[PDB]
Design an enzyme around this catalytic site. Structure first.
Site, PDB file in Angstrom:
ATOM      1  N   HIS A  52       0.800  -1.226   0.000  1.00  0.00           N
ATOM      2  CA  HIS A  52       0.000   0.000   0.000  1.00  0.00           C
ATOM      3  C   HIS A  52       0.835   1.280   0.000  1.00  0.00           C
ATOM      4  O   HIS A  52       0.303   2.368  -0.227  1.00  0.00           O
ATOM      5  CB  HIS A  52      -0.989   0.024   1.176  1.00  0.00           C
ATOM      6  CG  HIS A  52      -0.359   0.305   2.503  1.00  0.00           C
ATOM      7  ND1 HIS A  52      -0.027  -0.689   3.398  1.00  0.00           N
ATOM      8  CD2 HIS A  52      -0.007   1.475   3.091  1.00  0.00           C
ATOM      9  CE1 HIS A  52       0.499  -0.144   4.481  1.00  0.00           C
ATOM     10  NE2 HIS A  52       0.522   1.168   4.320  1.00  0.00           N
ATOM     11  N   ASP A  97      -0.205  -7.676   1.737  1.00  0.00           N
ATOM     12  CA  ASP A  97       0.337  -6.321   1.653  1.00  0.00           C
ATOM     13  C   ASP A  97       1.860  -6.292   1.708  1.00  0.00           C
ATOM     14  O   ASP A  97       2.450  -5.910   2.719  1.00  0.00           O
ATOM     15  CB  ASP A  97      -0.262  -5.500   2.797  1.00  0.00           C
ATOM     16  CG  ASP A  97       0.014  -4.017   2.671  1.00  0.00           C
ATOM     17  OD1 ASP A  97       0.449  -3.566   1.592  1.00  0.00           O
ATOM     18  OD2 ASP A  97      -0.230  -3.306   3.668  1.00  0.00           O
ATOM     19  N   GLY A 186       3.022   6.880   8.945  1.00  0.00           N
ATOM     20  CA  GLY A 186       4.437   6.995   8.623  1.00  0.00           C
ATOM     21  C   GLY A 186       5.223   5.738   8.972  1.00  0.00           C
ATOM     22  O   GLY A 186       6.372   5.583   8.548  1.00  0.00           O
ATOM     23  N   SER A 188       4.073   2.588   8.275  1.00  0.00           N
ATOM     24  CA  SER A 188       3.788   1.573   7.257  1.00  0.00           C
ATOM     25  C   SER A 188       5.014   1.093   6.492  1.00  0.00           C
ATOM     26  O   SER A 188       5.898   1.877   6.153  1.00  0.00           O
ATOM     27  CB  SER A 188       2.769   2.093   6.238  1.00  0.00           C
ATOM     28  OG  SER A 188       1.456   1.892   6.701  1.00  0.00           O
ATOM     29  N   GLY A 189       5.042  -0.205   6.204  1.00  0.00           N
ATOM     30  CA  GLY A 189       6.151  -0.774   5.460  1.00  0.00           C
ATOM     31  C   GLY A 189       7.316  -1.151   6.349  1.00  0.00           C
ATOM     32  O   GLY A 189       8.183  -1.929   5.938  1.00  0.00           O
TER      33      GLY A 189
END
Lengths: 238, 58
Positions: A52, A97, A186, A188-189
């Site tokens: 995402h 994801d 912020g 995410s990932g």
């Protein structure tokens, strides 16, 4: 992998990390230097992040960073050669994801830059296991903190997670938190790591959760054990 | 103009920090906001130009 040259000392309600103690943590930024997501180095040429995050080859990987507010800090701005988004990523349910980033030029590993370990598809990280997540996401639900943050949090059983999220929890998701801390805008990932025989191993990738970053609500992460076969296959083919 | 142009910006449940544009009917122009990366509503554009071409005047 999984062994920081600089040992860490153990995101809303987390704490500032020891500089360079999470050497695989990278910052994904646009051409201007704007941080939009985190990521994890899995080797000198590949970074794993969330699908995402929508990373493109115009974005850059920043490794060896601690204080994003420091212009003098020595870091590695790495160009991205190709983006490998998992074709099974479901833009509706957010399942699967995960995205892999192949660097144009390899990262130079050092005391502050190295890789996290990847688990085996069959690995079982028991619920209740204390793991850690890191990132530069908001510390209050507003600008991001300059210095890298961290937080220890427990993995949750799917049954316990579903007690809140119900059927929104899919097979390539794993929950953690609801313990007084929370990943936030912020993060995410970024990584959710747990120790495997003493080595920090990537168990989850910050994905989604409370829309207000509530610390009493389960955070949802992409379950790496369910996606690692895809990872290895992508590396082997590229 | 489409009614979705009158909806407040929607960040969504994902935890990214992605800059997007939304039309602000109160001001008459497109403004930036942080999008989480998933489940975007329609008043969410990758550029101010796209936003103005779709929602301008709403």
């Amino acid at each position: 992998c999984g062994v920081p040259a600089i040992q860490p000392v153990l995101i809303v309600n987390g704490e500032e990390a020891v500089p360079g103690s999470w050497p695989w943590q990278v910052s994904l930024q646009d051409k201007t230097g704007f941080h939009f997501c985190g990521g994890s180095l899995i080797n000198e040429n590949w970074v794993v992040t969330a699908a995402h995050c929508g990373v493109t080859t115009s974005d850059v990987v920043v490794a060896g960073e601690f204080d994003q507010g420091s212009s003098s800090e020595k870091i590695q701005k790495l160009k991205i050669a190709k983006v490998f988004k998992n074709s099974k990523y479901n833009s509706l349910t957010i399942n699967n994801d995960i995205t892999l980033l192949k660097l144009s030029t390899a990262a130079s590993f050092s005391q502050t830059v190295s890789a996290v370990c990847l688990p085996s598809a069959s690995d079982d990280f028991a619920a209740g296991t204390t793991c850690v997540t890191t990132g530069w996401g908001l510390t209050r639900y507003a600008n991001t903190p300059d210095r890298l943050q961290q937080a220890s949090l427990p993995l949750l059983s799917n049954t316990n997670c579903k007690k809140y999220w119900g059927t929104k929890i899919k097979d390539a998701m794993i929950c953690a938190g609801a313990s007084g801390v929370s990943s936030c805008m912020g993060d995410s990932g970024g990584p959710l790591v747990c120790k495997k025989n003493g080595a920090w191993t990537l168990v989850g990738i910050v994905s989604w959760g409370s829309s207000t970053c509530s610390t009493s609500t389960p955070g949802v992460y992409a379950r790496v054990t369910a996606l690692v076969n895809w990872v290895q296959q992508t590396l082997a083919a590229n | 103009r489409p009614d979705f142009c009158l909806e407040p910006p929607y960040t969504g449940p994902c935890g990214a920090r992605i800059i997007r544009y939304f039309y602000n009917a109160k001001a008459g122009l497109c403004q930036t906001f942080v999008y989480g990366g998933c489940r975007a509503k329609r008043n969410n554009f990758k550029s101010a130009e796209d936003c103005l071409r779709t929602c301008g005047g709403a």
